[PDB]
Amino acid sequence: ITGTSTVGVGRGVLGDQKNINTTYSTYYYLQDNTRGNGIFTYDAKYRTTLPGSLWADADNQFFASYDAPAVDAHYYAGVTYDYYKNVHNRLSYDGNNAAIRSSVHYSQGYNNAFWNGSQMVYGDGDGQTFIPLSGGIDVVAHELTHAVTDYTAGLIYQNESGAINEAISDIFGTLVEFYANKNPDWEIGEDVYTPGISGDSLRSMSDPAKYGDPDHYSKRYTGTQDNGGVHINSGIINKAAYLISQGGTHYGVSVVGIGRDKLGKIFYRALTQYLTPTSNFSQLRAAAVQSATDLYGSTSQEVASVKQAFDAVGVK
């Protein structure tokens, strides 16, 4: 909407106070004009019609329980925008400052969040498996990264290309979590998953097998569930990315770690310059090797570490 840029204040899903960019015109709206062509957050009102209504508030104060998922979806979209712009010189998900739209309160007790090809959508969770999913910065950044993938590599959401798609979202979700630097880790969803169980998460990149996901190509799922295992076989790529960044010895294969920033550069270049809609794991390995070669040189430690990591997870 047309109005003047304002700064509201509120509380997120985890009870933390933060400032949020709003727009004033009769009401204060969750419309941040400071980033690109805007970040807009909508109320789906427990229904599944999207996007719902642009979030309107009478006083620019967002401390009600009902406001919390909207506060975090809006704020963490801004953090994700900043990561892509500041770290990768990418202006929004399309590279041309497309408006970023998110809807919260989607459906009733909905235990998921997703990018739908046009916008981000967050369930509130059922209070047992999840609390409102926008409370996790890694979740928000994971889902917005699907939009980046849509506009670049276009990895088909099935089988190995789909597992790469998922892993790319887990990788950048985690790198955004480190960028914001609040309790960062290599786990996925830990801030909003199972409020009654401490210390767990939905997936682990450092040890995917902790939650039953494969950490080696020889353990890949080949069935048809989960679009051919896109959230299962992502563990193989998540483990390779973790090893590239942090190093370690995995199934007897040693990997020299090169750090998160270089991991992000290598995988962002692979995603935007080399991967295609049908890329498989072997082609991802070649894309990452070429990306590291472009950035650091063929004789670099970075190239050698990429090769070691894919070796360690059984991807040739």
Ligand X SMILES: CC[C@H](C)[C@H](N)C(=O)O
The footprint of ligand X (CB under 6 A) covers: 111-114, 133, 139, 142, 188-189, 202, 231
Taking the least distance from each CB to ligand X, the nearer of 105 and 142 is 142
Taking the least distance from each CB to Ca ion, the nearer of 84 and 193 is 193
Catalytic residue chosen out of the listed positions 74, 105, 216, 231 = 231
Among 25, 66, 200, 261, binds Ca ion (CB under 5 A): 200
Catalytic residue chosen out of the listed positions 143, 160, 250, 302 = 143
Residue 316, number of CB atoms within 10 A of its CB: 10
Alpha carbons 153 and 267: distance in angstroms, whole number: 12
With contact defined as beta carbons under 8 Å apart, do 48 and 60 qualify?
A: no
Residues 107-146 that bind Ca ion (CB under 5 A): 138
With contact defined as beta carbons under 8 Å apart, do 81 and 39 qualify?
A: yes
Alpha carbons 215 and 124: distance in angstroms, whole number: 30
Could you give phi then psi for residue 146, rounded to 5 degrees?
A: -60, -35
Distance in Å, CB of 231 to ligand X, minimum: 5
Residues paired with residue 9 on neighbouring β-strands, in sequence order: 19, 61
Q: Is 146 annotated as a binding residue?
A: yes
Alpha carbons 144 and 116: distance in angstroms, whole number: 10
Q: Is 138 annotated as a binding residue?
A: yes
Q: Which residues contact 216 (CB under 8 A, 6 or more apart)?
A: 236, 239, 250, 251, 313, 314
Taking the least distance from each CB to ligand X, the nearer of 53 and 128 is 128
Q: Is 2 annotated as a binding residue?
A: no
Taking the least distance from each CB to Ca ion, the nearer of 52 and 189 is 189
Point out the residue whose Cβ comes nearest to Ca ion.
Answer: 194
Give the torsion sign (CA, 184, 185, 191, 196). Answer: negative
Q: Is 22 annotated as a binding residue?
A: no
Which residues sit at the interface with Ca ion, rule CB under 5 A? 57, 59, 61, 138, 177, 183, 185, 187, 193-194, 197, 200
Any idea which residues carry the catalytic annotation? 143, 231
